């Protein structure tokens, strides 16, 4: 896994441009390869042996999940300590949802492509859990196709919204596939609304308390352009955010339904 990865000297890169932030992300130009890449440097000034090894586990987990809808990783840079990744021109879904009103055919495809990627992770032996899925992680290429990113919290802030209610109920609960299914439901909410969940609210703790009983983000209305598929996606979202995690569908089932929304 970590053998096909490379080590990058900072001399190999050029024209650094900040893009995200967590740790800052930079669009760099590999000079000898004549192509662009992304690199994520650590926030700290000193990088201890936990960081260096943690970054390596993130890279290994990315290479293991080589797939169409997963972000490719090339190696780890040493000069500044950071992860050398594929550059996605269109950037994050978060930025795209803020940017402008999106057509529904796209929205449904972004949802489906994300779902296919997540399904792939869960299909591994053993399953790879993402445990961090949010529109900031969901990255889009020049032609608006998804690649899932940020395996920093994977397993073999304003982010309370993506946290499952069972995680608030029980201190130190065992992580599962149904964690990702919940977060994915909140992503769907983001696509249907182009809003951030609980954006306007007074306080975190009140909403996090109400979530443990049943209070989820307010349902969007049925859209005019694609009212049949919208209603269907909304349905799926609701099943994906159920309080009882055994009621939530598997990504095998989810992909099966999101595919029909693209037909």
Chain positions contacting ligand B6J, by CB under 6 A: 19-22, 25, 38, 40, 71, 85-88, 91-92, 136-137, 139, 149-152
- Which of ligand B6J, Cl ion, none does 226 bind, CB closer than 5 to 8 A by kind? Cl ion
CA 117 to chain centre: 10
Residues in the chain, total: 263
> Do strands 73-77 and 6-8 pair parallel, antiparallel, or not at all (unpaired)?
parallel
Contact 196, 218 (CB under 8 A): no
Contact 158, 196 (CB under 8 A): yes
* Between 100 and 170, CB nearer to ligand B6J: 100
Q: How far is the CB of 60 from ligand B6J (least distance, A)?
A: 12
Residue 226 is a binding residue for Cl ion (CB under 5 A)? yes
Q: Which of 100, 200, 228, 244 binds Cl ion (CB under 5 A)?
A: 228
Residue 229 is a binding residue for Cl ion (CB under 5 A)? yes
- Which of Cl ion, ligand B6J, none does 228 bind, CB closer than 5 to 8 A by kind? Cl ion
Query: Cα separation of 186 and 206, whole Å?
Result: 18
* Window 111-130: residues binding Cl ion (CB under 5 A): none
Contact 73, 154 (CB under 8 A): no
83 exposed, middle or buried (CB, 10 Å; 0-12, 13-18, 19+)?
buried
- State both tokens at 227: 């009212």
* Between 56 and 223, CB nearer to Cl ion: 223
Binding segment toward Cl ion, per CB under 5 A, in 149-157, 196-204, 216-224, 228-236: 228-236
- State both tokens at 145: 């196709």
* Between 117 and 152, CB nearer to ligand B6J: 152
Q: How far is the CB of 252 from ligand B6J (least distance, A)?
A: 25
Q: Which residues are at the interface with Cl ion (CB under 5 A)?
A: 226, 228-229
């Amino acid at each position: 896994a970590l053998g096909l990865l490379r080590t990058f000297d900072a001399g190999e890169f050029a024209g650094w441009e900040k893009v995200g932030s967590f740790g800052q992300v930079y669009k760099v130009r590999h000079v000898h390869w004549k192509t662009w890449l992304a690199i994520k440097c650590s926030p700290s000034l000193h990088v201890d042996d936990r960081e260096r090894m943690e970054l390596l586990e993130e890279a290994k987990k990315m290479e293991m999940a080589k797939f169409r809808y997963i972000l490719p990783v090339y190696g780890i840079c040493q000069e500044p300590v950071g992860l050398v990744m594929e550059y996605m021109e269109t950037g994050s879904l978060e930025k795209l949802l803020a940017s402008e009103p999106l057509p529904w055919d796209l929205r449904f495809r972004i949802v489906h492509e994300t779902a296919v990627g997540m399904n792939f992770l869960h299909c591994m032996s053993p399953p790879l859990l993402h445990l961090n899925l949010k529109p900031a992680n969901i990255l889009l290429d020049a032609h608006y196709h998804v690649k899932i990113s940020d395996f920093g919290l994977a397993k073999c802030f304003g982010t309370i919204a993506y946290l499952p209610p069972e995680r608030i109920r029980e201190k130190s609960r065992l992580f599962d596939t149904k964690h990702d299914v919940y977060s994915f439901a909140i992503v769907i909410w983001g696509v249907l609304t182009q809003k951030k969940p609980f954006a306007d609210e007074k306080n975190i703790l009140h909403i996090m308390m109400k979530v443990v009983k049943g209070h989820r983000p307010e349902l969007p209305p049925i859209c005019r352009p694609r009212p049949r598929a919208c209603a269907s996606l909304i349905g799926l979202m609701q099943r994906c955010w159920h309080a009882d995690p055994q009621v939530r569908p598997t990504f095998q089932e989810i992909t099966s339904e999101t595919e029909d929304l693209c037909e």
